[PDB]
Scaffold this motif. Structure first.
Motif, short mmCIF file in Angstrom:
data_model
loop_
_atom_site.label_atom_id
_atom_site.label_comp_id
_atom_site.label_asym_id
_atom_site.label_seq_id
_atom_site.Cartn_x
_atom_site.Cartn_y
_atom_site.Cartn_z
N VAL A 159 0.88 -1.16 0.00
CA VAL A 159 0.00 0.00 0.00
C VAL A 159 0.92 1.21 0.00
CG1 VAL A 159 -1.63 1.40 1.34
CG2 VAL A 159 -1.99 -1.08 1.12
N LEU A 160 0.80 2.09 -1.00
CA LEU A 160 1.61 3.31 -1.09
C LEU A 160 0.98 4.48 -0.33
CD1 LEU A 160 2.65 3.06 -4.87
CD2 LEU A 160 3.99 2.44 -2.88
N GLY A 161 -0.34 4.47 -0.17
CA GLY A 161 -1.08 5.51 0.53
C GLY A 161 -2.56 5.19 0.64
N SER A 162 -3.30 5.90 1.52
CA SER A 162 -4.74 5.65 1.72
C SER A 162 -5.45 6.79 2.47
CB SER A 162 -4.96 4.32 2.45
OG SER A 162 -4.06 4.12 3.54
N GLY A 163 -6.79 6.79 2.43
CA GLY A 163 -7.59 7.76 3.16
C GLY A 163 -8.68 8.51 2.42
N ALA A 164 -9.93 8.39 2.92
CA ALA A 164 -11.17 9.06 2.48
C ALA A 164 -11.64 8.73 1.06
CB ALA A 164 -11.06 10.57 2.65
N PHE A 165 -10.75 8.78 0.06
CA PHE A 165 -11.13 8.47 -1.32
C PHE A 165 -10.92 6.99 -1.68
CE2 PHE A 165 -7.36 8.81 -4.46
CZ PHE A 165 -6.41 8.55 -3.51
N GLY A 166 -9.97 6.35 -1.00
CA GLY A 166 -9.59 4.96 -1.20
C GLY A 166 -8.10 4.74 -0.99
N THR A 167 -7.62 3.54 -1.34
CA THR A 167 -6.22 3.16 -1.18
C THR A 167 -5.49 3.12 -2.53
OG1 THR A 167 -6.87 1.87 0.75
CG2 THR A 167 -4.77 1.30 -0.26
N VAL A 168 -4.20 3.51 -2.54
CA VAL A 168 -3.32 3.49 -3.71
C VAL A 168 -2.32 2.39 -3.44
CG1 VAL A 168 -1.60 4.81 -5.03
CG2 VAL A 168 -3.60 5.98 -4.06
N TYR A 169 -2.20 1.42 -4.35
CA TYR A 169 -1.31 0.29 -4.16
C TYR A 169 -0.22 0.21 -5.20
CZ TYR A 169 -5.55 -1.68 -1.78
OH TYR A 169 -6.66 -1.87 -0.99
N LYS A 170 0.92 -0.37 -4.85
CA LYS A 170 1.96 -0.69 -5.82
C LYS A 170 1.47 -2.03 -6.41
CE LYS A 170 6.89 -1.58 -6.35
NZ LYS A 170 6.60 -2.25 -7.65
N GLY A 171 1.62 -2.23 -7.72
CA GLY A 171 1.15 -3.45 -8.35
C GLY A 171 1.85 -3.84 -9.63
N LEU A 172 1.39 -4.94 -10.22
CA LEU A 172 1.96 -5.42 -11.47
C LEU A 172 0.83 -5.75 -12.44
CD1 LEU A 172 4.93 -5.61 -12.14
CD2 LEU A 172 4.91 -8.01 -11.55
N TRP A 173 0.98 -5.35 -13.71
CA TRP A 173 -0.02 -5.62 -14.73
C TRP A 173 0.57 -6.52 -15.81
CZ3 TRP A 173 -0.77 -2.22 -19.46
CH2 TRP A 173 -1.79 -2.72 -20.27
N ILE A 174 0.05 -7.75 -15.87
CA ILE A 174 0.44 -8.78 -16.81
C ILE A 174 -0.79 -9.10 -17.64
CG2 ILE A 174 1.64 -11.01 -17.08
CD1 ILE A 174 1.22 -10.08 -13.51
N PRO A 175 -1.05 -8.34 -18.72
CA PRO A 175 -2.23 -8.64 -19.55
C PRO A 175 -2.15 -10.00 -20.24
CG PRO A 175 -0.92 -6.87 -20.53
CD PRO A 175 -0.26 -7.20 -19.23
#
Ligand SMILES: *CCC(=O)Nc1cc(Nc2nccc(-c3cn(C)c4ccccc34)n2)c(OC)cc1N(C)CCN(C)C
Length: 262
Positions: free
Chosen positions: A16-32
């Motif tokens: 989790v990179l950050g969070s609060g009131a609007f939702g959470t921002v996560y570090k992730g990986l996208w493998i289409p």
């Protein structure tokens, strides 16, 4: 058209990179599925086709200094996907590298942020949340404004008319840019530190502004004070800010006094 609709499968959250009131921002990986590649992304999972029309506007933003919305996942929550900025935010960057940043770096970031905002202004868009925490570092000399479109309160970054009348213009964005520049010139100091948020309007109406950062010459601080003029139309324009800071970035040692720069 440029808004890739994702399935939960092609992306996986890590930290989790950050969070609060609007939702959470996560570090992730996208493998289409169709591809064989792993792309580092940041995922803003909002709280519970409502804001899908705003996401198509975010996906159409085409400028090197504004983060583009890569994709979305519309399930019970809205999940927004964008390129991960591996160096983090510029506010954490100026705090971490406090003693190794020269005047050319700061003045160039000022040009880049002004450019990204002037692009948003040309597209008839208002940011409503410009701050150093919302400027991200792609590489040390390439920054991009993030969180465009999340606005549809950051009192210490708001223009007077925004606190009082809820007015959001390109001129109120210029005020927030003036504060963002103050954050960069002070290496990440908190604006109006200690001072409660309920009295910021009193302080602004009184005539009080953020103090002159030590590294700023009078010429640089005057641009900042012009952004904070009560009269929105007397503030500089984002295209004048690009001009002022681009010229300053040609002879950077004249405008910023950095110990350990020349
Ligand atoms: C100012 C805090 C911050 O943004 N820090 C980090 C950002 C990283 N990258 C990244 N890339 C794209 C988008 C975002 C992003 C967008 N929004 C609105 C965010 C809000 C909060 C946090 C991130 C946000 N972020 C990043 O990637 C390597 C790392 C960080 N931080 C969290 C590193 C650790 N920090 C405490 C020093």
């Amino acid at each position: 058209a440029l808004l890739r609709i994702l399935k939960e499968t092609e992306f996986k959250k890590i930290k989790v990179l950050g969070s609060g009131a609007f939702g959470t921002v996560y570090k992730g990986l996208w493998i289409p599925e169709g591809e064989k590649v792993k792309i580092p992304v940041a995922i803003k999972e909002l709280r519970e086709k409502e804001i899908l029309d705003e996401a198509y506007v975010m996906a159409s933003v085409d400028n090197p200094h504004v983060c583009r919305l890569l994709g979305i996942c519309l399930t019970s929550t809205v999940q927004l996907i964008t390129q991960l900025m591996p160096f983090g935010c510029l506010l954490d960057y100026v705090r971490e590298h406090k003693d190794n940043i020269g005047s050319q770096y700061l003045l160039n970031w000022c040009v880049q942020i002004a450019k990204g905002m002037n692009y948003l202004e040309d597209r008839r868009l208002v940011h409503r949340d410009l701050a150093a925490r919302n400027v991200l570092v792609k590489t040390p000399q390439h920054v991009k404004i993030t969180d465009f479109g999340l606005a549809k309160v950051p009192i210490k970054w708001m223009a007077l008319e925004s606190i009082l009348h809820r007015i959001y213009t390109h001129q109120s964005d210029v005020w927030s840019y003036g504060v963002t520049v103050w954050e960069l010139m002070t290496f990440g100091s908190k604006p109006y530190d200690g001072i409660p948020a309920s009295e910021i309007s009193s302080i602004l109406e009184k005539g009080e502004r953020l103090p002159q950062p030590p590294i700023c010459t009078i010429d640089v601080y005057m641009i900042m004070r012009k952004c904070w003029m009560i009269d929105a139309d007397s503030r500089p324009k984002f295209r004048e800010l690009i001009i002022e800071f681009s010229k300053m970035a040609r002879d950077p040692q004249r405008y910023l006094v950095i110990q350990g720069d020349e």
